[PDB]
Amino acid sequence: HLILHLLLQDS
């Protein structure tokens, strides 16, 4: 799930 976050925070 961490990836799902590193994706939202990056954007």
What is the token pair recorded at 5?
A: 């976050």
* Chain centroid to CA 3: 5
Q: Which ranges constitute the DSSP H helices of the chain?
A: 2-8
Q: What does the alpha-carbon distance between residue 11 and residue 7 come to, in Å, rounded to a whole number? A: 6
Decide: helix, strand or coil at residue 1. coil
Decide: helix, strand or coil at residue 4. helix
Residue 10 phi, psi (nearest 5): -70, -50
Residue 2 phi, psi (nearest 5): -45, -35
Q: What does the alpha-carbon distance between residue 9 and residue 4 come to, in Å, rounded to a whole number? A: 9
